[PDB]
Each structure stands twice: as C-alpha cells, then as structure tokens.
Amino acid sequence: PGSQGAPGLQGAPGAPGSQGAPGLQGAPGAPGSQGAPGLQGAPG
Amino acid sequence: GAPGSQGAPGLQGAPGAPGSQGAPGLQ
C-alpha cells in the first residue's frame, strides 16, 4: 500500500444535456379556408 | 497507465442528425 493508483476512470460527469434534434414540424399547412369565386348566383 | 485491454474513453457523442431531409410532395 502507498502507490494508490487511480484506475477508477469513471466518466460522463457533465455529459448530460443534449437536445439532439426534434421531430419535423408537427404538421405543415397553409392556414386559410379555400375560398373561391363561388357558383351560379344569378342564373337569370 | 494502460486500462487493461479496454479503457480508452475515445467516444463519439452526438455525431449529428443527418436524417432531417423532408420531402412533402404536396401536389
């Protein structure tokens, strides 16, 4: 006894914290109701 | 000072995120 080697070598102390990559956008979209010209509203 | 056939802590944390291609066809 006396040499007291340090072979514990334990690691990854501060490794925590990693926002790797979130999924894609929950869903794309084109907000708006597809309004349009209409239809026949003055036939005669 | 060797780790005894194992103990080289060379690690590859977070190589990256390449799979974010995305291809909305959206005809």
DSSP assignment of chain A, as one string?
A: ------------SS---------S-S-----S--------S---
Sign of the Cα torsion A27, A28, A31, A35 reads negative
Query: Contact at 8 Å (CB) between A25 and B23?
Result: no
Q: Which residue of B has its CA nearest to A29?
A: B26
The tokens describing B20, both together, are: 């974010």
Residues of B with Cβ-Cβ distance to A7 under 8 angstroms: 3
Question: CB of B1 within 8 Å of any CB in chain A?
Answer: no
| Technique used | cryo-EM
Q: Report which DSSP code applies to B7.
A: -
Residues 6+ apart with CB under 8 A from B13: A15, A18
Report the 10 Å Cβ neighbour count for A11.
9
Q: What is the resolution of this structure in A?
A: 9.8
CA distance A9 to B8: 10
Short-list B11, B22, B16, CA closest to A11: B11
The tokens describing A2, both together, are: 């006396």
Listed by number, the residues of chain B in 4-23 with a beta carbon closer than 8 Å to a beta carbon of chain A are: 7, 9, 13-14, 17, 20, 22
